[PDB]
């Protein structure tokens, strides 16, 4: 079966790790042990085809700015994640994408834009702003909620579809 | 193939 190498990219300190953790947990299990392979590999069925998602999320290593190229080099599809309560993280997206395009040497890299509602803090990035950015890039926008798991599956499956349709 | 350092 096909394996997809996905990479999570985005600003630190705004709980981006919730995205992959939530995909990986059983939906009814709240534990997580990041120290075992089962923590970043998941077999799923998308549009009737079974595949294995391998998900790199380097949350916590954002100060290692010179390792971003190494990490992005491993991916074939990218989730660019910002927090809907943190405007600065939304602003960083542009440079993250420039860097993915340079690393992959391609103007057309499978990618998805994800707006993550991780806090009880007030939204500062309106869905319209983010839809407009996504459109100007020619990529999907998905919103997710860390407390309910709404949107999570959709963000990853949309990225897999972007790879299958590349 | 592969990395610029692959024999």
């Amino acid at each position: 079966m096909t394996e997809y190498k996905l990479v999570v990219v985005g600003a630190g300190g705004v709980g981006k790790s919730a995205l992959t953790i939530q995909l990986i947990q059983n939906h009814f299990v709240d534990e997580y042990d990041p120290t075992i392979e089962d923590s970043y590999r998941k077999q799923v069925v998308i549009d009737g085809e079974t595949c294995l998602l391998d998900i790199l999320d380097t949350a916590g290593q954002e100060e290692y700015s010179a390792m971003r190229d190494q990490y992005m080099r491993t991916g074939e599809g990218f989730l660019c994640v910002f927090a809907i309560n943190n405007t600065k993280s939304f602003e960083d997206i542009h440079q993250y994408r420039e860097q993915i395009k340079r690393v992959k040497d391609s103007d057309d890299v499978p990618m998805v834009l994800v707006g993550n509602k991780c806090d009880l803090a007030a939204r500062t990035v309106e869905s319209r702003q983010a839809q407009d950015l996504a459109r100007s890039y020619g990529i999907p926008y998905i919103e997710t909620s860390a407390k309910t798991r709404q949107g999570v599956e959709d963000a990853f499956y949309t990225l897999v579809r972007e790879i299958r349709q590349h | 193939x592969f990395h610029p350092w692959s024999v």
Binding site: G15, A18, P34, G60, Y64, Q70, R73, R102 | P4, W5
Partner: protein, 449 residues
């Protein structure tokens, strides 16, 4: 044995599924059951349990408790635990409950002041309360534990073999003006970088790590040694890239890349994995990775050396994780994996479990974090048998490849240099004049004696 009324002494309430849960598939360590979750009252009770001492619980608790309990509150709790009212048969109760529980309280204070003194440095009133409490403790059994705590408190308020010969290449001792990537000896570069990076690794304390503080808005305040360590690593990666792409003549640039692989080789021999990954990240960067004409002339043996190093990072560091488990100190681990694992352990597990409608502190998540900080401490113990060279050390402490530029401007400049020295096909490859006056041949990575 008969205890006081919960009405008068909160730590007398019996265990129930509403106040303490244990792990139901872990083997107890040394006959002691593994606590899964509990009220803070029950966690304090087991921290000072009368049936036996629990040093591992004490270590984990004092390392991780600040997420669920503030330091002033913990002090009030263990003082309350110490003050046991009596309900003849008092001799038994005094002998098997009051005295051992009080010794446990003093042991917790001792470990608190000895290994977590930063709580007291940041809250003088906390230290005032602790000294008051210790001063009220008047018993013949506790006299020498009280005295030992006072000794610690007052103190806090204030190789077998010889190392190898230092190596020299083109630059001579004391000639800092000529120190550079190609003029210093590659062995000595790896050695002094390993001494710097080992000191950087050894200075990181758990207080900079628990609570994922290095990722929050106050990181510069709470995690300064961790950040200094990371920024050293970033700097060295960027200096490597800069040395490569600013050497515009192809032959010379091949010499630069080959000398950097030689430094990686000695990093591997020293078990400096932070150094290994500095080189690997440089070789993976956009400006360097595309230099096909340069890697073409890299001798195959050095290609294999780099290949082995790079493969350490593949598959979420699978081979790095095995290699590190198998080596013995001294080494310098790569810190990034620790940080990711602590962050995801804290963010991916609930602070609290609920049983019968009652809230319980999720302690096993804290135990997992304390396992990670313990693995870090275990590699901080052994130093390297290598001599410092003050001038080389100083030269690498003050590398500033970015200069005054911002990150984006500087990495765009590296990428544009890459494109200039090796343009995208089908632009022809240009030629560029040499910039080095001295010979490019490496002395190799075997000592002179």
């Amino acid at each position: 044995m008969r205890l006081p009324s919960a009405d008068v002494y909160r730590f007398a309430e019996p265990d129930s599924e509403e106040n303490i849960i244990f792990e139901e598939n872990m083997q107890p360590k040394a006959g002691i059951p593994i606590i899964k979750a509990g009220t803070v009252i029950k966690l304090i009770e087991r921290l000072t349990y009368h049936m036996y001492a629990d040093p591992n619980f004490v270590r984990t608790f004092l390392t991780t408790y600040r997420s669920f309990c503030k330091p002033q509150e913990l002090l009030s709790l263990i003082i309350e635990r110490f003050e046991i009212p009596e309900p003849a048969e008092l001799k038994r109760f005094r002998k098997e409950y009051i005295q051992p529980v009080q010794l446990r309280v003093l042991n917790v204070c001792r470990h608190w002041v000895e290994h977590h003194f930063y709580d007291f440095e940041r809250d003088a009133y906390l230290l005032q309360r602790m000294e008051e409490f210790i001063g009220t403790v008047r018993g013949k059994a506790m006299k020498k534990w009280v005295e030992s705590i006072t000794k610690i408190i007052q103190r806090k308020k204030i190789f077998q073999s010889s190392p190898p010969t230092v190596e020299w290449h083109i630059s001579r001792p004391g000639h800092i003006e000529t120190f550079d990537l190609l003029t210093l000896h590659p062995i000595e570069i790896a050695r002094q970088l390993t001494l710097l990076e080992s000191d950087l690794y050894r200075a990181v304390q758990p207080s900079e790590l628990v609570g994922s503080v290095w990722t929050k808005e106050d990181k510069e305040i709470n995690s300064p040694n961790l950040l200094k360590m990371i920024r050293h690593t970033t700097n060295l990666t960027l200096w490597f890239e800069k040395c490569i792409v600013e050497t515009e003549n192809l032959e010379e640039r091949v010499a630069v890349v080959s000398r950097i692989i030689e430094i990686l080789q000695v990093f591997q021999e020293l078990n400096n994995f932070n150094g290994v990954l500095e080189v690997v990240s440089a070789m993976n960067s956009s400006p360097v990775y595309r230099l096909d004409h340069t890697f073409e002339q890299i001798p195959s043996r050095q290609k294999k050396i780099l290949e082995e190093a790079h493969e350490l990072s593949e598959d979420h560091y699978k081979k790095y994780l095995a290699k590190l488990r198998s080596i013995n100190p001294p080494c310098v681990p790569f810190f990034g994996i620790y940080l990711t694992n602590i962050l995801k352990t804290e963010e991916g597990n609930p602070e609290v479990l609920k049983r019968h409608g009652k809230e319980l502190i999720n302690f096993s998540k804290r135990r997992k974090v304390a396992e990670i900080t313990g693995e870090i401490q275990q590699y901080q113990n052994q130093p390297y048998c290598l001599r410092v060279e003050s001038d080389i050390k100083r030269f690498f402490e003050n590398l500033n490849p970015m200069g005054n530029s911002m990150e984006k401007e500087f990495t765009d400049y590296l990428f544009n240099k890459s494109l200039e020295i090796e343009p995208r096909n089908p632009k022809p490859l240009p030629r560029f004049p040499k910039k080095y006056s001295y010979p490019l041949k490496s002395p190799g990575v075997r000592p002179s004696n």
